[PDB]
Swiss-Prot record, chain C:
UniProt-recorded name of the protein: Proteasome subunit alpha type-6
The species this protein was found in: Homo sapiens
Record InterPro entries: Ntn_hydrolases_N, Proteasome_alpha, Proteasome_alpha-type, Proteasome_asu_N, Proteasome_sua/b, Proteasome_subunit_alpha6
Glycosylation sites: S5
SMART domains, sorted: Proteasome_A_N (SM00948)
Modified residues (N6-acetyllysine): K102, K104
From Swiss-Prot, chain F:
Residues with Phosphoserine modification: S7, S14
Name under which the protein is recorded: Proteasome subunit alpha type-5
Species annotation: Homo sapiens (Human)
Positions of post-translational Phosphothreonine modification: T6
Subunit and partners: The 26S proteasome consists of a 20S proteasome core and two 19S regulatory subunits. The 20S proteasome core is a barrel-shaped complex made of 28 subunits that are arranged in four stacked rings. The two outer rings are each formed by seven alpha subunits, and the two inner rings are formed by seven beta subunits. The proteolytic activity is exerted by three beta-subunits PSMB5, PSMB6 and PSMB7. PSMA5 interacts directly with the PSMG1-PSMG2 heterodimer which promotes 20S proteasome assembly.
Family: Belongs to the peptidase T1A family.
Compartments where found: Cytoplasm; Nucleus
Swiss-Prot record, chain H:
Organism expressing this protein natively: Homo sapiens (Human)
InterPro entries per record: Ntn_hydrolases_N, Proteasome_alpha, Proteasome_alpha-type, Proteasome_asu_N, Proteasome_bsu_CS, Proteasome_sua/b
Gene name linked to the record: PSMA4
Complex and partners: The 26S proteasome consists of a 20S proteasome core and two 19S regulatory subunits. The 20S proteasome core is a barrel-shaped complex made of 28 subunits that are arranged in four stacked rings. The two outer rings are each formed by seven alpha subunits, and the two inner rings are formed by seven beta subunits. The proteolytic activity is exerted by three beta-subunits PSMB5, PSMB6 and PSMB7.
Name of the protein described by the UniProt record: Proteasome subunit alpha type-4
Lineage start: Eukaryota, Metazoa, Chordata, Craniata, Vertebrata
Biological processes annotated in GO: proteasome-mediated ubiquitin-dependent protein catabolic process
Keywords: Acetylation, Cytoplasm, Host-virus interaction, Nucleus, Phosphoprotein, Proteasome
Places the protein is found: Cytoplasm; Nucleus
Swiss-Prot record, chain I:
High-level lineage: Eukaryota, Metazoa, Chordata, Craniata, Vertebrata
InterPro entries: Ntn_hydrolases_N, Pept_T1A_subB, Proteasome_bsu_C, Proteasome_bsu_CS, Proteasome_sua/b, Proteasome_suB-type
Species whose genome carries this gene: Homo sapiens (Human)
Propeptide cleavage-removed residue intervals: 1-38
GO cellular component, one term: cytosol
Protein name: Proteasome subunit beta type-7
Single annotated GO MF: endopeptidase activity
UniProt gene name: PSMB7
Domain of life: Eukaryota
Family: Belongs to the peptidase T1B family.
Active site: T39 (nucleophile)
Subunit annotation: The 26S proteasome consists of a 20S proteasome core and two 19S regulatory subunits. The 20S proteasome core is a barrel-shaped complex made of 28 subunits that are arranged in four stacked rings. The two outer rings are each formed by seven alpha subunits, and the two inner rings are formed by seven beta subunits. The proteolytic activity is exerted by three beta-subunits PSMB5, PSMB6 and PSMB7. (Microbial infection) Interacts with HIV-1 Tat protein.
Record's catalysed reaction(s): Cleavage of peptide bonds with very broad specificity
Length: 238, 197, 245, 103, 213, 96, 205, 251, 259, 234
């Protein structure tokens, strides 16, 4: 039918298989990322704290390059493939151009790969949405979001996966220049957004911090719990 | 033509190289750095035929950085040396040989310091100290004479200075400046360049 | 297949039936029956004979061109039953394979090896989806250096067995029964005896007495290993001998 | 590139040995049989090769061997170096895209 | 062995003017010590505002001229307009560099009016490099012809002289004289001189007989 | 063209729908964004190739004709490389 | 100059009574210049199985690594220790895969049968020519000297320790007469009970 | 659904690949395979499944497969797909060894095989590999590890996990009876025996219905050995004695 | 696995991408030699079958490498071949053709024919344009009777009652021309072949050591490896038996191996 | 649960997770002629029945029991042409192994390679699985071997098993009869008895085909020897 073949256009003009890939993305766990002054931070809500499992092997936030990060929401295997391809392309660009990879360049490459996989009906689209965030050569913070269709958009603050809409409303309501100015403010904003996403929070918070001229580092559960306690104290004060 | 040198100590590997890039009879560049940063603990001293040097060094460097990005941990100096030897041999056997002389130096938290010698035929060989170029002939004798397995960092720098003075005294080509770097457990530290005005 | 695999079990060659049967091969056999003719081959201790009914439909049709007896090489001949075009294609393939065998191995291909190659190609046809089995049957004859006369029939499924008396076509079952009865009674099986056996078997199963022009007979003997097509006069002489006794 | 120039005069011949053999067989059939035999064999080969393992996995190509007459013939090609023991394997998706003609 | 190139002689020359672009060449096709034919102009007209002269290996010259004509037709079909002289020069440079490792043994000089109606002369080497000049001579006698062109048209080494603009009649007389001298001193030139004058009205062809060998 | 900004957080500059093919050529897209990106890349490459080959600016009609020639290869490219299996889902306005 | 003489090298293997011995030099050098005095030419291809490669150092290393790759895959598939004859066949196939441009090395294999514990020695040519002889096999830039010493010294049914003495003397006297070989000798004595690795003192000239 | 489950590449309206789910169901149809991680070492305890009397065991590992010196794996799914996957695992490990002259880390090999499986699941016309693999190995970066692969192409590091028949019950039992940090090889074997005894309800284990392989580090060398039938019998006897003692104490 | 940018699937077959190294090394200065076997192989056609002969010396350069080399190669139970020239090339050629003939016999179910092996050998050698140095003497007794062939490396064959190949072939062929009879007896043929091989051994530097024989007939296959031992090493006069402690060691590493 | 669409396709998994086409191939195997293989201490015997439709069948033309190499033989139940193609492939693989390693191929390795071929054919969509299962016999390292390669590509090492029609009854009969230390020339009698159980009519020398493998190597028993064994066992 119209909804079974990727290449077939629906009478309305839809490529329903791309939209089904988007639905698969929505099925994934929530990933939230905001942009700040010389501070870019990512956050992914873990679906469940599965005991007897190594958290290192199921991380959702990875580093494409020393100056670029990426978080995904959707099929994990597709995300791994896209991440490997993005890393390879980043190194190839650093080889051929000798300059550090811009966030725009890698975001465009990922979008092009996803669109190319959407081209033919033999290949299914990648069912992932990626939040590529990092610093450019000049150090300007950059946040971007790609879709299975192959469209990339810059965002000041975005959320993908399940419950993305509510977290996006939260961010829109609580995005201010003062919050962006302070790195701790941005981190607290992301903690609050993810806590809104998942009531339990705490151990389920998977937050990563990247600052100017500093490699990606993932805050340990101790720091995440400290920030959660700070948010709880602030709420109690009110 | 281009001179490389490497001295391995109990907990460090001292390496140095001349800074002369000459075309025909003129030194086009007098501050040409021949050290390539493989990773935070590995250096690749590469000399050879014009474009082969830069191309091969950068290719291996990007491969090592890709390994770091994908796995999250750096290649061991032995692993990096073996990977470089494999790629160099594969390219040499193929229709695009790379005429590059390599001197890989690195420090491992488990194995410790390591210096690796490689010729353009991709014959790997770990040695306590080694050199490349026509100055190796004049300097390996001094290294053999004055090298001690438990040689201090300052004594290693003194031996390097002796080698460079011999190069100035006897080597036909002028090599006034040498870039000197050391690799410790704390990382790669750039030392003051030894200059002979 | 480029067009696409069919749905039903019997609508495609590759997919199996619940028992595991391939209905397309059976339908290829039904096509062989649809050919409309019957071919009988008899093996003796001196020669091998292939007899098939020749039916020139129209007077305008040139009877010389209407024939199902083809020679693969100078010593091996075959009679084909089934679709005419498929039989011609299989004949061409067998000729090419025999020539290649002669070129590569330095000696003429045995009949058994020829049918083995043909059956391997047929199996390849029955395994893939793009192609379909050929709706025809190949019966090869020839004198082996050591084994003497050899008769092999060579089917769409990929079965290349050899027989002492082969039958193929619409009346395959009745011809097979008649030949089994004759074989159970072991005669001398001379050349003319084998020719008479084949002709009388065909006449009995078809319930008709052939004239010289209604059948074509090809023979190959130990004394004369070359594949020979019996001239209409010789077929008439054999028929007269049958009528007399 | 200099790679286009063969290193050995025999290298170019034996590198395309199977392709040259198929071309010679097609030429002989087409000289003698006609246009039908080469076209038939080309379609047959295309059909058998269209169904196989993905590029990063070594395929058996049994039907192709049977059609080419190599099912009972062994040469240096089959024994000297094993495609199964490649010693060099690229990214699965990269190899699939390369075969598809995308790269 | 086998030599893909042979020198068939021929001398070309182009002079640019305010409203004219003279493209002149000889008609001597000579391979080795013999003369193939006495009637083979080296100048072929491409458009109404461009004439190209080819000298050197005759086969390469013919192939290049045919390729240029085909590319002109392709450009007309695609862009729905005739290619300009500068565009033809750039395309010829790209074509020549395409066969860099098997270079065309052709000396190419493009002469014709530009979009402003001014004579434009483009000189080419076998590899493909080109530039715009006011006058140029190519072929076997290029070295013989160039000095007089520099002396007269360029007014070089002429102290206290009037830089009179180059008129058409003076250009034709200069061309005739230089080619007469070439026929006198160069064995690859003579027979006849084909002069193609490219003006806004069209292309005029003039033939002047030169002394035979 | 009008930018459809779903949320204020998304950067308005990120929603680019009028682009620069060449200094003298611009294009406005409407439809599928990524198909537009592919067509724009083709147009830019064609214009630069024309400049390289002929040392002149490519006519707007020629650029549109080239992009159209790219935009009709659905089941008719006859090329082994993966072509446009489905028709492009974007309409372009090459204003130059 | 010969390609083998570019890097030198000298490997020897000898057979005793229920024991086998293999020895090689430790010099690595480009043409005349020495680089290291610890280069390894003998590689373990099993418990009671060693292969010694002499020739171009890079080719030696490439062949050793590829042979180890094939050996590991073979042992994983079969689940049994490889036989010396099977190892010889694998090396021959590997070398003949590069017939028209060869690996500039002449490996020699020495080891005991994993089941019968029968000594086995063999030598391979440039393009993989098997050659099994019960007395001894030599390979390197000093083939003539090693041949002479082995012929003059080898005896049947040598006692392990005296087999070591004989092979060590042969190798030392052969390399002492070769310029591009020497700078120490490594000897491996392989027996079913144990394996002894010994480094001899030699002229460092 | 009867739709979106034909080409292995059709996304369901909710974004589901039903063919991968059917492959996982096929895994569930397979025999029980269990793996437990302990500080001393990591082990694999797998149900032999086939127990036919006339069946012969000529190989040392009925379903355990040694990938390299430092790694081993177990299978629960289609046997032939498992064989090809194990061959690919060995090939990849040996390729890494050839290139870097060092043993391949476990995560790298698991990632390579999962990439292969995901590629098979991504391109149409190819049946997804209906095999789930459990990997045990030791490397110089993270020491002992236990990994689990899926037909989809997703892996994960576990301390104690089970695949195949009655996987959920085994996982729950492991969660109940696993002490993160204090688990030793002997206690790990006892826990594996208990889990197998409870999961396989046919009867008590007879050391022929199960196959246990332990991976340890001795003298700086990874030792992968399959426990002999007598050792498995002794472990089963110890478990039975413990159960009887607990029942007697309960009264 | 491999590292980045591996597109084409592995290509089965010979790997010639290694001659640039050879060219570079030769340009740097001035190739090592391979065993050429310095052979003397001969065969005759007697009344009942074929008798083949060979020597057992393999020479690398001008130094004897192998003093006992089997140069009569097995092709089939009724077909045998003798190899001359490059040792490895002859070995691989004979092994490959033997495997192909074994497959052919298994498919056919009948004994292979000598003509088939000759055709395969010559076709392959011509395909390789003589780059494979395989001087071969092919002999066997098929259903059509005894047959003897002489296959040259370039791919030319010739069926003759007696053939010789190798560097010492001329002496053996002179012996044949002197003392050849049509329809010889088994003993006479064996003696003639042995004399030819001995003449080649004693008159050619490349040939030496022992004499190999292979009697092929419709009834039996008689492979005689140590048929004759004309040359042998002399007795060693002085004893250089090295005693324990003669050699000085530097390091000791005793590694016990578990049994 | 009709699951017709799932059954039509090979690459399509059933909702329960079963490959239906593989089961149909197994059914095709079960519908083939019975074949019995017994691994005795002295050797291994492969006995099958070649149901000849009519007396006008040349027994020497085709053979259900075929040799792979000098020491490995096999028998099949199911489709003949598939068996012939697999026999050719097995012979080629054995010869390739011999050329590479200069050693007779172990039976286990040949079985693994054949099973890999079967898996390759049952994986890709566009072809059908081989509707035949091979009972492969061999003798390596002074030890008999008996293997059974299924259409799916799963191979099992048996001491005694039967395939084809009435294979369950044959396996039960073998369980009742087979003995641990049973020797050759008696496992032959056991296989003949199993065929008798699975045979409809009287078994003659030409109605069955028996092939044995021992230390000497694989050898297909001549019709005379089969007749003597039949007379001895009855």
């Amino acid at each position: 039918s119209y909804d079974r073949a990727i290449t077939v256009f629906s009478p309305d003009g839809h490529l329903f298989q791309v939209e089904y890939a988007q639905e698969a993305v929505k099925k994934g766990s929530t990933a939230v990322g905001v942009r700040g002054r010389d501070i870019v931070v990512l956050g992914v809500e873990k679906k469940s704290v599965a005991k007897l499992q190594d958290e290192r092997t199921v991380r959702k936030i990875c580093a494409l390059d020393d100056n670029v990060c990426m978080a995904f929401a959707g099929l994990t295997a597709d995300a791994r493939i896209v991440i490997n391809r993005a890393r390879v392309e980043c190194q190839s660009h650093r080889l051929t151009v000798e300059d550090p990879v811009t966030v725009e360049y890698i975001t465009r490459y990922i979008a092009s790969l996803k669109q190319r996989y959407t081209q033919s009906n033999g290949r299914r689209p990648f069912g992932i949405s990626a939040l590529i965030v990092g610093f450019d050569f000049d150090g300007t913070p950059r946040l971007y979001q790609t879709d299975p269709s192959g469209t990339y958009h810059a965002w000041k603050a975005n959320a993908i996966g399940r419950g993305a809409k509510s977290v996006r409303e939260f961010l829109e309501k609580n995005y201010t220049d003062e919050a962006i100015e302070t790195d701790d403010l941005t981190i607290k904003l992301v903690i609050k957004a993810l806590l809104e996403v998942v009531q339990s929070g705490g151990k389920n918070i998977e937050l990563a911090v990247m600052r100017r001229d500093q490699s990606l580092k993932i805050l340990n559960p101790e720091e995440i719990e400290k920030y959660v306690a700070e948010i709880e104290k602030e709420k109690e004060e009110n | 033509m281009e001179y490389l040198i490497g001295i391995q100590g109990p907990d460090y590997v001292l390496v140095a190289s001349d800074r002369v890039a000459a075309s025909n009879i003129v030194q086009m560049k007098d501050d040409h750095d021949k050290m390539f940063k493989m990773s935070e603990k590995i250096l690749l001293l590469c000399v050879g035929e014009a474009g082969d040097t830069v191309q091969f060094a950068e290719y291996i460097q990007k491969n090592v950085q890709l390994y770091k990005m994908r796995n999250g941990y750096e290649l061991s100096p032995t692993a990096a040396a073996n990977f470089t030897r494999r790629n160099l041999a594969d390219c040499l056997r193929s229709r695009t040989p790379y005429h590059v002389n390599l001197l890989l130096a690195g420090y491992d938290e488990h194995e410790g310091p390591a210096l690796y010698y490689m010729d353009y035929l991709a014959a790997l060989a770990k040695a306590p100290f080694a050199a490349h170029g026509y100055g190796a002939f004049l300097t390996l004798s001094i290294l053999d004479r004055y090298y001690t397995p438990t040689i201090s960092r300052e004594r290693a720098v003194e031996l390097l200075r002796k080698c460079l003075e011999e190069l100035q005294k006897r080597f036909i080509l002028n090599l006034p400046t040498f870039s000197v770097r050391i690799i410790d457990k704390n990382g790669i530290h750039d030392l003051d360049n030894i200059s002979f005005p | 297949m480029s067009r696409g695999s069919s749905a039903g079990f019997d609508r495609h060659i590759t997919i199996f039936s619940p028992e595991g049967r391939l209905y397309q091969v059976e339908y290829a056999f039904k096509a062989i029956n649809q050919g409309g003719l019957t071919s009988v081959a008899v093996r003796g201790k001196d020669c091998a004979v292939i007899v098939t009914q020749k039916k020139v439909p129209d007077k305008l049709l040139d009877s010389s061109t209407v024939t199902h007896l083809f020679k693969i090489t100078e010593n091996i001949g075959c009679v084909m039953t089934g679709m005419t075009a498929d039989s011609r294609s299989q004949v061409q393939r067998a000729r090419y394979e025999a020539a290649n065998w002669k070129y590569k191995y330095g000696y003429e291909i045995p009949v058994d090896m020829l049918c083995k190659r043909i059956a391997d190609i047929s199996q390849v046809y029955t395994q893939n989806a793009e192609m379909r089995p050929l709706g025809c049957c190949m019966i090869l004859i020839g004198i082996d250096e050591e084994q003497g006369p050899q008769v092999y029939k060579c089917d769409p499924a990929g079965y290349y067995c050899g027989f002492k008396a082969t039958a193929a076509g619409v009346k395959q079952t009745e011809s097979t029964s008649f030949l089994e009865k004759k074989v159970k009674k072991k005669f001398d099986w001379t050349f003319e005896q084998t020719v008479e056996t084949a002709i009388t078997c065909l006449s009995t199963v078809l319930s008709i007495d052939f004239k010289p022009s209604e059948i074509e007979v090809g023979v190959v003997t130990v004394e004369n290993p070359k594949f020979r097509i019996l001239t209409e006069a010789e077929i008439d002489a054999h028929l007269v001998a049958l009528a007399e006794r | 590139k200099n790679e286009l120039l063969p290193s050995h005069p025999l290298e170019l011949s034996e590198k395309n040995f199977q392709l040259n053999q198929d071309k010679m067989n097609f030429s002989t059939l087409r000289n003698i049989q006609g246009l039908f035999a080469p076209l038939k064999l080309q379609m047959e080969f295309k059909a058998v090769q269209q169904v196989q393992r993905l590029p990063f996995l070594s395929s058996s190509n049994l039907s192709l061997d049977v059609l080419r007459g190599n099912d009972e013939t062994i040469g240096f090609e089959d024994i000297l170096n094993d495609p199964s023991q490649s010693e060099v394997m690229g990214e699965p998706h990269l190899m699939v895209e390369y075969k598809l003609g995308l790269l | 062995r086998f030599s893909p190139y042979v020198f068939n002689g021929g001398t070309i020359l182009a002079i640019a003017g305010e409203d004219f672009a003279i493209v002149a060449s000889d008609t001597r096709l000579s391979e080795g010590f013999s003369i193939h034919t006495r009637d083979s102009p080296k100048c072929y007209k491409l458009t109404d505002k461009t004439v190209i002269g080819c000298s050197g290996f005759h086969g390469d010259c013919l192939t290049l001229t045919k390729i240029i004509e085909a590319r002109l037709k392709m450009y007309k079909h695609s862009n729905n307009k005739a290619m300009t002289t500068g565009a033809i020069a750039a395309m010829l440079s790209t074509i020549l560099y395409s066969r860099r490792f098997f270079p065309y043994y052709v000396y190419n000089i493009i002469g014709g009016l530009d979009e402003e109606g001014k004579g434009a002369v483009y000189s080419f080497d076998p590899v493909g490099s080109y530039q715009r000049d006011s006058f140029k001579a190519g072929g076997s006698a290029s070295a013989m012809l160039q000095p007089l062109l520099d002396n007269q048209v360029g007014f070089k080494n002429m102290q206290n002289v009037e830089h009179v603009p180059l008129s058409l009649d003076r250009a034709m007389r200069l061309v005739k004289d230089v080619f007469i001298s070439a026929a006198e001193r160069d064995v690859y030139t003579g027979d006849a001189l084909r002069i193609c004058i490219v003006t806004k009205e069209g292309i005029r062809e003039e033939t002047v007989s030169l002394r035979k060998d | 063209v009008e930018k459809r900004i779903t949320s204020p957080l998304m950067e308005p500059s990120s929603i680019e729908k009028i682009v620069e093919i060449d200094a003298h050529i611009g294009c406005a897209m409407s439809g599928l964004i990524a198909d537009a990106k592919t067509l724009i890349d083709k147009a830019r490459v064609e214009t630069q190739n024309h400049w390289f080959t002929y040392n002149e600016t490519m006519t707007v009609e020629s650029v549109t004709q080239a992009v159209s020639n790219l935009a009709l290869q659905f089941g008719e490219e006859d090329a082994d490389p993966g072509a446009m299996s489905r028709p492009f889902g974007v309409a372009l306005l090459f204003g130059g | 100059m010969s390609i083998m003489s570019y890097n030198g090298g000298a490997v020897m293997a000898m057979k005793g009574k229920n024991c086998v011995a293999i020895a090689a030099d430790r010099r690595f050098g480009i043409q005349a210049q020495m680089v290291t005095t610890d280069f390894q030419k003998i590689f373990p291809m099993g418990d009671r199985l060693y292969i010694g490669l002499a020739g171009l150092a890079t080719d030696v290393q490439t062949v050793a690594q590829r042979l180890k790759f094939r050996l590991n895959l073979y042992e994983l598939k079969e689940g049994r220790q490889i036989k010396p004859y099977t190892l010889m066949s694998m090396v021959a196939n590997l070398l003949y895969e590069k017939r028209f441009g060869p690996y500039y090395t002449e490996p020699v294999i020495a080891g005991l049968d994993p089941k019968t514990f029968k000594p086995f020695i063999c030598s391979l040519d440039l393009i993989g020519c098997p050659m099994v002889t019960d007395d001894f096999v030599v390979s390197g830039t000093c083939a003539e000297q090693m041949y002479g010493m082995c012929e003059s010294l080898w005896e049947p049914n040598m006692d392990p320790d005296h087999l070591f003495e004989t092979i060590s003397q042969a190798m030392l006297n052969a390399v002492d007469r070769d310029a591009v070989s020497g700078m120490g000798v490594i000897v491996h004595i392989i027996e079913k009970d144990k394996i002894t690795t010994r480094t001899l003192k030699a002229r460092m000239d | 659904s009867r739709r979106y489950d034909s080409r292995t590449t059709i996304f369901s309206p909710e974004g589901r690949l039903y063919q991968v789910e059917y492959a996982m169901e096929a895994i569930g149809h397979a025999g029980t395979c269990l793996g437990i991680l302990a500080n001393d070492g990591v082990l694999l305890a797998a149900e032999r499944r086939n127990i036919h009397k006339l069946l012969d065991e000529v190989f040392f590992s009925e379903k355990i497969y040694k990938l390299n010196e430092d790694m081993a794996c177990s299978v629960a799914g289609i046997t032939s797909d498992a064989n090809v996957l194990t061959n690919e695992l060995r090939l990849i490990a040996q390729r890494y060894l050839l290139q870097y002259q060092e043993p391949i880390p476990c995560e790298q090999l698991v990632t390579a095989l999962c990439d292969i499986k995901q590629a098979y699941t991504q391109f149409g016309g190819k049946r997804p590999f209906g095999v789930s693999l459990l990997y045990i190995g030791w490397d110089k970066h993270y020491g002992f590890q236990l990994y689990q692969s899926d037909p989809s192409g997703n892996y994960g590091g576990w301390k104690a996990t089970c695949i195949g028949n009655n996987s959920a019950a085994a996982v729950s039992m492991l969660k109940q009876d696993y002490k993160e940090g204090e688990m030793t090889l002997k206690s790990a074997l006892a826990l594996a025996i208990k889990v197998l005894n409870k999961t396989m309800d046919v009867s008590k284990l007879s050391a022929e219905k199960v196959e246990i392989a332990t991976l340890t580090r001795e003298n700086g060398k990874t030792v992968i050995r399959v426990l002999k039938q007598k050792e498995v019998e002794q472990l089963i006897k110890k478990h039975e004695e413990e159960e009887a003692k607990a029942e007697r104490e309960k009264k | 696995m491999a590292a980045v940018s591996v597109y084409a699937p592995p290509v089965g077959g010979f790997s010639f991408d290694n001659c640039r190294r050879n060219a570079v090394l030769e340009a740097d200065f001035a190739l090592p030699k391979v065993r050429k076997t310095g052979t003397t192989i001969a065969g005759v056609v007697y009344k009942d079958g074929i008798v083949l002969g060979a020597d057992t010396r393999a020479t690398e350069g001008m130094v004897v490498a192998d003093k006992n080399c089997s140069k009569i190669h097995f092709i089939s139970p009724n077909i045998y071949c003798c190899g001359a020239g490059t040792a490895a090339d002859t070995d691989m050629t004979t092994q490959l053709i033997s495997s192909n003939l074994e497959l052919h016999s298994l498919s056919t179910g009948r004994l292979p024919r000598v003509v088939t092996a000759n055709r395969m050998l010559k076709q392959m050698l011509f395909r390789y344009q003589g780059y494979i140095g395989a001087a071969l003497v092919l002999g066997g007794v098929d259903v059509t009777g005894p047959h003897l062939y002489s296959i040259y490396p370039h791919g030319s064959t010739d069926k003759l009652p007696y053939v010789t190949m190798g560097s010492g072939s001329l002496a053996a062929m002179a012996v044949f021309e002197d003392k050849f009879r049509p329809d010889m007896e088994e003993e006479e043929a064996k003696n003639l072949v042995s004399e030819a091989i001995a003449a080649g051994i004693f008159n050619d530097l490349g040939s030496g050591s022992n004499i190999d024989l292979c009697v092929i007939s419709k009834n039996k296959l008689d492979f005689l490896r140590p048929y004759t031992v004309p040359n042998k090493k002399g007795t060693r006069l002085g004893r250089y038996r090295c005693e324990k402690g003669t050699t000085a060691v530097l390091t000791e590493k005793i590694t016990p191996l578990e049994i | 649960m009709a699951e017709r669409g799932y059954s039509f396709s090979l690459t399509t998994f059933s909702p329960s997770g079963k490959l239906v086409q593989i089961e149909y191939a197994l059914a095709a195997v079960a519908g083939g002629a019975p074949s019995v293989g017994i691994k005795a201490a002295n050797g291994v015997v492969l006995a099958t029945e070649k149901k000849q439709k009519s007396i006008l069948y040349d027994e020497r033309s085709v053979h259900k029991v075929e040799p792979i190499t000098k020491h490995i033989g096999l028998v099949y139940s199911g489709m003949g042409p598939d068996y012939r193609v697999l026999v050719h492939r097995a012979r080629k693989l054995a010869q390739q192994y011999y050329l590479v390693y200069q050693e007779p191929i172990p039976t286990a390795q040949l079985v693994q390679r054949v099973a890999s071929v079967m898996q390759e054919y049952t994986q890709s969509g566009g072809v059908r699985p081989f509707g035949v299962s091979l009972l492969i016999c061999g003798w390596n390292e002074g030890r008999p071997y008996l293997f059974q390669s299924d259409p799916s590509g799963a191979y099992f090492a048996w001491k005694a098993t039967a395939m084809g029609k009435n294979y369950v009854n044959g396996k039960t009969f073998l369980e009742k009869r087979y003995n641990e230390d049973l020797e050759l020339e008696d496992a032959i009698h056991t296989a003949i008895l199993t065929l008798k159980e699975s045979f409809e009519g009287q078994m003659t020398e030409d109605n069955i085909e028996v092939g044995i493998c021992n230390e000497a190597g694989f050898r297909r028993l001549t019709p005379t020897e089969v007749k003597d064994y039949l007379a001895a066992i009855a």
